[PDB]
Design a protein around this ligand. Structure first.
Ligand code: NA
Lengths: 101, 108, 106
């Protein structure tokens, strides 16, 4: 699976190793080995979420086929980033094997 | 709606409050309430657009039910071009827009 | 075509002009005029790839309008380009292909 996290938290305000712990959490939540989970974190962006520029984060999850998981990812992200659930949005994307290189 | 804007303009050359004004613009253009509009701006990137590295921007727009036909998208893009060329001081030829329909189940 | 490259290499360690050379390389590999090739490079990110945070890169390729043989050859040549330019092992690079139709282009 591929996880992409955009956030407007400055890079020097994000917990060190977030990408590694999010990788481990997604492995458990999605039932996959950690070495098949890929995580990309992009901090320091300019973001409006639900029309507000308050601190927020967007998570995208892509996997083969169609994939609550949302509840578990909210749990982890609220704890790591101190963001309320109202400041986080999650999207899921299906892939087909021909798209993998 | 979800709007994602990549640009090679430095952050200091992106006008303050752009993400908020693009929010209101997208709500009017797409016919969605502002509290459902999400904007992500990623400045300072390294970009080539149409083979040139001069200042440029790429905008991606994703939404349920509204960006699924050429007739719909031609109408939306005209309004988004007029807004971005004014805000970013870029020529129309330096901006590319892509539309992605979302299916309802994809929202977590 | 649209190429987007995410990497956790700090911007200062990405070779200068990478986006120009990737543009030219992609035109040759994908068989498209260079003026139809768009490249976006996002460096300095935080990434875990195959469970490791060692330097890595992800390349996404979207084209308007492949065979298994075609995309297999494209992937191999993009691996060759990225390992040379970024000094990464092949195990530190992932590639994804995405479909696009003309009605999606403004
Ligand atoms: Na539609």
């Amino acid at each position: 699976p591929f996880l992409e996290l955009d956030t407007n938290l400055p890079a020097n305000r994000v917990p060190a190793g977030l990408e590694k712990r999010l990788c481990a959490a997604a492995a458990s939540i999605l039932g996959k080995p950690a070495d098949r989970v890929n995580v990309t974190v992009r901090p320091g962006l300019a973001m409006a979420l639900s029309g507000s520029t308050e601190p927020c984060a967007q998570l995208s999850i892509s996997s083969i086929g169609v994939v609550s998981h949302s509840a578990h990812f909210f749990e982890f992200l609220t704890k790591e980033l101190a963001l309320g659930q109202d400041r986080i949005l999650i999207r899921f994307f299906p892939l087909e094997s021909w798209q993998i290189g």
